[PDB]
């Protein structure tokens, strides 16, 4: 059925009639691109980037047809044919298989078709998130203490993934005795793309938690091999099977992550043997390598930090600089998270900050960092220091959980947490410290940060290191003690550095804390004066 509304337009029986669609691309540059006539290079650049046209030349090709195809190539339109031709990669391609010509052309022109609906019987929507189904409603249960279940998103070469390939290994939920039963669940999502890299694998994986939760009748909580999934009996009635897991995952992966994901393959494994074999072969090595990469990343290896300005809605001058060792002070934005956000969401909160114009690497001063901070904060903050608390410190917004303040009598710094409602050696409570520190104002001697920055190598590197930590609430100390002791052992100190740090149980007062520190041989009493 041919028509303009049917999007099937016959131009003419002569080869020269192909110019009538060429002028469509040409006038698209003239009308929508706003390019004046005579700017041929700009028009050719426009049609190559903006007009997703391609040529399918069928049947024997005369010299005139080939020369007209060279015109299509001149406009950036790849030419596909079923004839033997002198192929040019990405420009002139031979595809004899008529069953694959459409798919070949879409790949050659980088055309993606949006799957409007997910082919599932059960309703899919965001409003169905958090609707817990009880034991009475439940049919199937995966993971937890009942059995072993795992999920993994891995990047693979395009050859190893097949587009829209949803397969199930082992029995389905239809073989269940109709009683609530236990069976292992292995979810394996292979994703391939030109812009996809390994550092983006965790991010997509997190979205899996939401993608399964938007289906009514199924709930997913947990991560990696701690997968914990429940499927209700009503899903069993409506016609929900394990293949719809793959259908939903594929649809949402191609929708949300179309920028970096070109091909997606979802595999559901139910066999006791195959699930464990694939978890051992694929899941655990990638979990270990992700943990190792998170552990081993330092500011020296990278050459690009990331600026985040998400919290400028309530702290107009606040700019967060995220390094491998300095997390976003909200505690939820990391260096890898910022890189993934910049790749997936350009013109978003996270932007690249090149490491150029190094001024003081001990203190953490770069000319490019100062330039970016001045630009993003709209000139409110001009010069910043990444690793020092007293000299041109970073600002704080108000999402932070921990506040580090300076205690000069102890020649160190105390730390307060949001959940700690009592007083500190410093006097101010967390609320007064929060009012003094947050809001995007550079306040020397005070800073806001998360729990992970405490055990960092760059924590107060400009003032000596984390040896300045002289007071900390007992819960915070118990949470951080392992990594704090590791970093202090690397610094210059016996491993049990947590015990020398005072807490609210021992003493919350100036002279008492000072006496405990000096009787305990705290390193902060043997350093240079902090101010």
């Amino acid at each position: 059925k041919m028509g303009l509304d049917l999007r099937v337009i016959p131009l003419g029986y002569d080869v020269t009639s192909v110019i009538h669609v060429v002028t469509i691309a040409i006038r698209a540059a003239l009308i929508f691109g706003g390019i004046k006539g005579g700017q041929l290079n700009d028009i050719l650049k426009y049609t190559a980037e903006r007009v997703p046209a391609f040529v399918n030349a069928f049947g024997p090709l005369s010299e005139l047809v080939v020369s007209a195809g060279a015109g299509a190539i001149a406009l950036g339109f790849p030419v596909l044919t079923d004839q033997v031709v002198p192929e040019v990669p990405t420009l002139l391609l031979t595809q004899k298989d008529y069953d694959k010509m459409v798919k070949t052309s879409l790949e050659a022109r980088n055309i993606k078709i949006k799957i409007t609906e997910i082919p599932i019987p059960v309703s899919f929507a965001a409003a169905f998130e958090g609707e817990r189904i009880r034991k009475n409603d439940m049919l199937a249960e995966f993971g937890g203490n009942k059995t072993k279940a795992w999920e993994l998103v891995m990047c693979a070469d395009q050859g190893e993934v097949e587009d829209h390939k949803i397969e199930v290994i082992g029995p389905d939920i239809d073989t269940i005795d109709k009683a609530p039963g236990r069976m292992p669940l292995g979810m394996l999502i292979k994703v391939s793309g030109t812009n996809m890299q390994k550092d983006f694998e965790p991010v997509l994986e997190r979205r899996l938690h939401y993608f399964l939760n938007y289906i009514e009748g199924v709930m997913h909580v947990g991560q990696r091999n701690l997968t914990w999934v429940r499927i209700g009996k009503e899903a069993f009635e409506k016609g929900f099977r394990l293949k719809h897991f793959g259908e939903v995952i594929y649809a949402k992966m191609l929708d949300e992550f179309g920028s970096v994901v070109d091909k997606c393959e979802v595999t559901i494994i139910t066999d006791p043997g195959k699930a464990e074999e694939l978890e051992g072969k694929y899941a655990v090595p990638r979990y270990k390598e992700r943990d190792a990469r998170l552990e081993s990343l330092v500011d020296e290896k990278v050459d690009t930090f990331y600026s985040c300005n998400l919290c400028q809605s309530f702290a107009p001058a606040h700019v967060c600089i995220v390094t491998p060792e300095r997390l976003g002070l909200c505690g939820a934005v990391s260096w890898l998270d910022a890189k993934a956000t910049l790749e997936l969401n350009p013109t978003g909160p996270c932007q690249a900050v090149p490491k150029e114009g190094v001024v003081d690497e001990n203190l953490g001063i770069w000319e490019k960092v100062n330039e970016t901070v001045s630009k993003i904060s709209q000139g409110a903050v001009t010069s910043v220091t990444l690793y020092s608390i007293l000299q041109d410190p970073m600002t704080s917004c108000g999402c932070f959980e921990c506040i580090t303040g300076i205690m000069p009598e102890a020649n160190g710094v105390v730390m307060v947490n949001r959940e700690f409602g009592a007083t500190t050696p410093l006097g101010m409570t967390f609320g007064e410290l929060a009012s003094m520190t947050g809001g995007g104002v550079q306040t020397p001697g005070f800073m806001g940060h998360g729990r992970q920055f405490i055990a960092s190598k760059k924590f107060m590197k400009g003032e000596g290191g984390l040896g300045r930590i002289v007071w900390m609430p007992k819960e915070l100390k118990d949470f951080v003690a392992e990594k704090l002791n590791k970093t202090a052992k690397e610094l210059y100190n016996i491993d049990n550095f947590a015990d020398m740090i005072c807490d609210e149980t021992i003493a919350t007062e100036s002279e008492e804390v000072v006496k405990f520190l000096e009787e305990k041989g705290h390193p902060a009493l043997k350093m240079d004066p902090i101010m």
Partner: protein, 442 residues
């Protein structure tokens, strides 16, 4: 504020009342407390920090206990930069060349236009009594206003020193504003206001003449000043006000570091809507004390609403108290309505509920001081928070009613709540707040 800590004796004797010397350093750095509260301060550093802590703009206090208002004390030209400290005040203008009917009408308007909006009492703050030529009528008007019973501060506008000497003792004990200093009578005005530390109003033609007059007054030793930016037209008055504020703030000049008084009734020729427009303008543009011809609800509602909005602290917005709010004297059996900590949200919701006259208990969780969806999209408003607050608040005081209404604009929160509150009947009510009174009625 860590710089002043070095000048401090660094001996946490807690004589100042602040827990540590660093606590005192940070308290006086914010400008909340002056530097003189340290008894052990070294004299040289004491003077140094008396000069250093000196605010760029002086704060003038006018009135007694129930009519005490603070003017000035600002630090930035835009509220998003740091904040706006002291809200502007409104005066109603009376003149001795007025009929007794008009004076009585204005007094009745001052008494009638008085309400409470989000915990702040909106009412006329000042009576600006102007001298129009007759001493006896001026004194009679002052006595009539005093005896009428209006709870307002007093601003006596009289450039005649002879009249002012007799008029001042009528309202001297109430800490008034004495406006009328000129280039020739400022000596006598300073002598009049110097004994009781009364605020003195300074006026001159042009900004340069005003600057010279303020310098002449300051050389006499008086600093309790309220400036009149002047201007024969609206454009010139706006220019003078903006220039005074920017000279004080951007130029770091203490000569113009004083609140301004703007007579909008004279600029607008008693035009009500032009008064509203200029009052909003000078609320946003450095007008400390705005004088208006009259006061009614058409003036009061938008002006007071906007003034309440503008002078909120950007870092700490208005938040209602956590707990269980009783509306329409709820008994044991009364429906329970849950809503966020945001003051505007609670204001609207409780206005709808109180108008419904149905006894409805109200529960406020800790949503971070954000609207329902702003907090929800930020994730601070979930079903877990509602369950936690319902369990802890103490709803057990009143029982036999399990229908709980939840903000309708967030409906995705439903599924969790029924699991977290099995006995409670969780209802996701209508989105719009105008549906609330009918739903409570039915």
């Amino acid at each position: 504020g860590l710089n002043i800590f070095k000048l401090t004796p660094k001996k946490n004797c807690k004589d100042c009342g602040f827990p540590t010397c660093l606590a005192f350093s940070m308290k006086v750095a914010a400008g909340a407390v002056e530097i003189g509260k340290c008894p052990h301060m070294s004299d040289e550093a004491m003077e140094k920090l008396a000069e250093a802590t000196a605010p760029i703009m002086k704060t003038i206090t006018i009135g007694k206990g129930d009519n005490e208002y603070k003017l000035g004390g600002e630090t930035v030209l835009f509220r998003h930069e740091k904040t706006f400290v002291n809200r502007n005040r409104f005066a109603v203008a009376f003149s001795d060349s007025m009929d007794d009917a008009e004076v009585d009408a204005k007094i009745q308007h001052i008494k009638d236009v008085d309400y409470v909006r989000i915990g702040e009492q909106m009412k006329t703050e000042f009576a600006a009594i102007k001298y129009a030529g007759n001493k006896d009528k001026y004194l009679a008007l002052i006595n009539k206003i005093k005896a009428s019973g209006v709870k307002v501060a007093y601003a006596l506008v009289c450039e005649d020193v002879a009249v002012m000497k007799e008029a001042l003792p009528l309202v001297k004990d109430e800490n008034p504003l004495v406006y009328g200093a000129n280039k020739d009578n400022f000596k006598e005005m300073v002598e009049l206001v110097k004994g009781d530390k009364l605020a003195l109003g300074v006026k001159a033609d042009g900004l340069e003449a005003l600057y010279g007059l303020v310098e002449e007054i300051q050389k006499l030793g008086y600093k309790n000043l309220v400036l009149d930016p002047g201007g024969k037209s609206i454009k010139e008055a706006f220019e003078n006000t903006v220039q005074i504020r920017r000279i004080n703030i951007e130029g770091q000049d203490r000569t113009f570091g004083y609140p301004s008084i703007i007579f909008l009734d004279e600029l607008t020729k008693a035009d009500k809507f032009m008064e509203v427009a200029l009052s909003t303008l000078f609320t946003l543009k450095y007008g400390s004390l705005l004088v208006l011809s009259d006061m009614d609800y058409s003036r009061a509602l938008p002006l007071y609403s906007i003034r309440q909005n503008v002078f909120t602290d950007p870092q700490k917005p208005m938040t209602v108290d956590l707990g269980i709010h009783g509306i329409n004297n709820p008994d044991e059996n009364s429906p329970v309505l849950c809503t966020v900590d945001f003051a505007l949200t609670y204001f609207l919701v409780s206005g709808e509920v109180e108008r419904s006259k149905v006894p409805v208990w109200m529960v406020i969780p800790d949503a971070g001081g954000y609207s329902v969806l702003t907090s929800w999209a930020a994730g601070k408003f979930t079903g877990a928070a509602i369950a936690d607050e319902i369990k802890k608040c103490g709803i057990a005081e009143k029982t036999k009613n399990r229908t709980l209404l939840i903000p309708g604009k967030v409906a995705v929160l439903k599924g969790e709540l029924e699991e977290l509150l099995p006995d409670w009947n969780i209802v996701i009510s209508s989105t719009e707040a105008m549906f609330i009174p009918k739903l409570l009625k039915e």
